[PDB]
């Protein structure tokens, strides 16, 4: 019968729990209290980028630390110049229900997708002066929740039908399918060496995937509700998550445990976005009570607050050299902090 | 001025992009945006056909006014993760089939889905147009099967006109937002253009009564 499943599942859950608890010598709070505090951090608004007419859901910096891209619920996708606040391109969309965008690493393409179950590719460098479509990638049965490029020919997606996927842009067919979640998948983030990626879903669990073998390798538990955002540490050997539990957490890939939690009693709303700084000392978490906080990642104290919007902050991103910090929100304004 | 001859031509470009991005924004302050719901019966097939893979959009005109209608029934995922995209539609259109009171498993299921959207935190000020389908097939089954199969507490007659008037009281007693929003029931007279003119009246009622709150007059 199916009762012979039960002793196999229950012993292996008890075996993994005994293996993790054996190697917990001391916590991160114990060894780090000799280090000096960060002090107080005060940042100010240097630019303000205007021109959208609806709520903003996505944003991604380019790799030269000067260009960026953004998408709203109007049928527009706009590429900005962050030093002079000028507009370079403006792209009309086919469907208006947009939830994702990503910038190419060579600064050559841009991608977009939403409730119409399709990820679309745009070409910025034609011979006529227009941005055109190059591919449309179909095959998911749920809304696209994220997308990231590996190079000019491979893209990893994520949809709400419990399934991640790896594509080929030149041919059109997906070559690897990643299965194993039991709820809708919300986010992903690649690695610095570009061989692994993590993923967080509605199961209150996050998994580590292998890109070339096409299989899961580890799984991390500990949240109490859906996971909305995830981000990868610059070493390549930790990550941080963001949930509707109103709690960020820090996990480890080589000890397979949780290290520290970043909670405070005056916060009751959930996290939308998560990013790190350049040295990996600060943790920036955008919230739902209209502002954004700053956390010391090594000692769990908060250092600053960034308050500039009437409505929910829905996206943020730290640049590749470390100068600026961008935020976007539902009152239709982008602000660059420095 | 302290700008080069290239950098002086990279602001004339950015000012011709805003002049087209504005001219497509009062072009969409003319159009009316409607959401459609209901369980996946055949009631949706009649309404789309009479008004002329994830989202399906339908557009139609009636007396120089433009409507767009959004069917979101083909998704089959978690509803609490995309339903805040439709905050700001004018009116929600709901669909209920009358004759399914005995197939009492179905009729309680439509009451569960009407109650969830009528009291969301995203739809505190949105009118609910309410259609009721299959009025011809309803009087055939009521002569053979009483209403007490579906509603046990029915102390009424079980005649035709006194039973169908008991259905409208049940959907409209679920509203816990009596001081903000309103429901406009209309029996689906499937023969004429009366279907789209009720609905033409239902949106002129809600545009006028929204402007009398923006000027602070109420």
């Amino acid at each position, epitope marked *: 019968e199916l009762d012979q499943l039960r002793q196999e599942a229950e012993q292996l859950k008890n075996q993994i729990r005994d293996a993790r608890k054996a190697c917990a010598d001391a916590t991160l709070s114990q060894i780090t209290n000799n280090i000096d505090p960060v002090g107080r951090i005060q940042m100010r608004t240097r630019r303000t980028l205007r021109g959208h007419l609806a709520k903003i859901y996505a944003m991604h910096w380019g790799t030269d630390s000067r*260009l960026l891209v953004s998408a709203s619920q109007d049928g527009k996708l706009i590429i900005w*110049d962050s030093y002079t606040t*000028n507009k*370079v391109h403006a792209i009309p969309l086919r469907s208006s229900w947009v939830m994702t965008c990503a910038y190419a690493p060579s600064g050559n393409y841009v991608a977009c997708g939403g409730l119409d179950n399709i990820c679309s590719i745009y070409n910025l460098k034609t*011979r*006529e*002066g*227009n941005v055109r479509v190059s591919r449309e990638l179909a095959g998911h049965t749920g809304y696209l929740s994220c997308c990231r490029f590996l190079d000019d020919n491979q893209i990893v997606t994520s949809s709400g039908d419990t399934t991640c996927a790896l594509w080929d842009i030149e041919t059109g067919q997906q070559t690897t399918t990643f299965t194993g979640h039991t709820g809708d998948v919300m986010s992903l983030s690649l690695a610095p060496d570009t061989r692994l990626f993590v993923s967080g879903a509605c199961d209150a669990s996050a998994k580590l995937w292998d890109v070339r073998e096409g299989m899961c390798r580890q799984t991390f538990t500990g949240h109490e509700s859906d996971i909305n955002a995830i981000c990868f540490f610059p070493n390549g050997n930790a990550f941080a998550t963001g949930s509707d539990d109103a709690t960020c957490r820090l996990f480890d890939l080589r000890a397979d445990q949780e290290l520290m939690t970043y909670s405070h009693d005056n916060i009751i709303c959930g996290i939308t976005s998560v990013s790190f700084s350049k040295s990996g000392r600060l943790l920036l978490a955008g919230y739902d009570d209209f502002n954004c906080n700053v956390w010391d990642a090594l000692k769990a104290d908060r250092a600053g607050v960034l308050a500039g919007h009437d409505n929910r902050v829905s996206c943020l991103g730290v640049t590749d050299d470390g100068m600026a910090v961008a935020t976007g929100s539902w009152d239709s304004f982008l602000k660059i902090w420095n | 001025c*302290t700008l*080069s*001859a*290239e*950098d002086k*031509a*990279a602001v*004339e*470009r950015s000012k*011709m992009i805003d002049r087209n991005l504005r001219e497509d924004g009062e072009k969409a302050a003319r159009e009316v945006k409607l959401l459609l719901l209901g369980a996946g019966e055949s009631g949706k097939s009649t309404i789309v056909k009479q008004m002329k893979t994830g989202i399906v959009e339908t557009h139609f005109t009636f007396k120089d006014l433009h409507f767009k209608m959004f069917d979101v029934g083909g998704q089959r995922s978690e509803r609490k993760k995309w339903i805040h995209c439709f905050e700001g539609v004018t009116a929600i259109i709901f669909c209920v089939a009358l004759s399914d009171y005995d197939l009492m498993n179905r009729m309680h299921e439509s009451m569960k889905l009407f109650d969830s959207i009528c009291n969301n935190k995203w739809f505190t000020d949105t009118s609910i147009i309410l259609f009721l389908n299959k009025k011809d097939l309803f009087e055939e089954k009521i002569k053979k099967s009483p209403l007490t199969i579906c509603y046990p507490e029915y102390a009424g007659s079980n005649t035709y006109e006194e039973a169908a008037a008991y259905i409208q009281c049940q959907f409209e007693d679920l509203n816990k937002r009596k001081d903000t929003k309103e429901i406009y029931t209309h029996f689906t007279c499937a023969t004429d253009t009366k279907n789209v003119q009720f609905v033409f009246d239902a949106v002129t009622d809600v545009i006028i009564k929204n402007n009398l709150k923006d000027c602070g007059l109420f």
Partner: single-chain antibody
Framework: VQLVESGGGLVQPGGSRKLSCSAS????????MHWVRQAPEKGLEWVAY????????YYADTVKGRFTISRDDPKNTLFLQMTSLRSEDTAMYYC??????????????WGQGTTLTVSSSDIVMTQATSSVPVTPGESVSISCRSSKSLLHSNGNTYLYWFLQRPGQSPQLLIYRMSNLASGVPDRFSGSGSGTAFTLTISRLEAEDVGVYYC?????????FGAGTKLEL
């Protein structure tokens, strides 16, 4: 991508003509346009400009009151109207494409030209070479000079390099001093600083025989150098 243009002929002095070009596909309504000129057996020379959206219009101080320019935008056609022609107007005429935003490459497509023979404060560029003989396989260096610094406070240096094979239109090679255009072999390069600039060629092939020009685009009245000729 094509620009095809016609007109010209024999004109008695004091008369009038108009010139016209046509575009093909091309997304004509996002490109600013120029008219560039050269005399028989002389160098290049710049004439006029009409922007995108028909806003900014500029001219030369030689042609300020005689020539006027206009754009017929839904029909994909560019115009230039001539009044009271003199003997200094015997030349060729070229329609030239450009785009101005961050990262672009202006001056990248010339037309085929049109003959016209009538009846019978500025930054100064200079280059001294004339008809140097070069054995193939060897490296060459060509240099021009400026009377004012072209480096700007924003970091850009505005010097552009061209090439003209005999019987052809000019072609872009180096659009800003450290950047080479698309479709150009990697053996070309360019460096310089301040007011002294030089081009370099790695391995000369048989198709690099022709004249060379250097142009400034810092302050507006555009000035070309004279002609440096390569011969074998």
């Amino acid at each position: 991508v094509q620009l095809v243009e016609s007109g010209g002929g024999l004109v008695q002095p004091g008369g009038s003509r108009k010139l016209s070009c046509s575009a093909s596909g091309f997304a004509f309504s996002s490109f600013g346009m120029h008219w560039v000129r050269q005399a028989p057996e002389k160098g290049l020379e710049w004439v006029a400009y009409i922007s995108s959206g028909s806003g900014t219009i500029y001219y030369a101080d030689t042609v300020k009151g005689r020539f006027t320019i206009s754009r017929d935008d839904p029909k994909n056609t560019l115009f230039l109207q001539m009044t009271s022609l003199r003997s200094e107007d015997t030349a060729m005429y070229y329609c030239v494409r450009s785009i101005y935003y961050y990262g672009s490459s202006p001056f990248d497509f010339w037309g085929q030209g049109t003959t016209l023979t009538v009846s019978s404060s500025d930054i100064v560029m200079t280059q001294a070479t004339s008809s140097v003989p070069v054995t193939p396989g060897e490296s060459v260096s060509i240099s021009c000079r400026s009377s004012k610094s072209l480096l700007h406070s924003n970091g850009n240096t505005y010097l552009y390099w061209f090439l003209q094979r005999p019987g052809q239109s000019p072609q872009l090679l180096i659009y800003r001093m450290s950047n080479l255009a698309s479709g150009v072999p990697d053996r070309f390069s360019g460096s310089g600083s301040g007011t002294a600039f030089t081009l370099t060629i790695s391995r000369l092939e048989a198709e690099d025989v022709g004249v060379y020009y250097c142009m400034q685009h810092l302050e507006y009245p555009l000035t070309f150098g004279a002609g440096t000729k390569l011969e074998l």
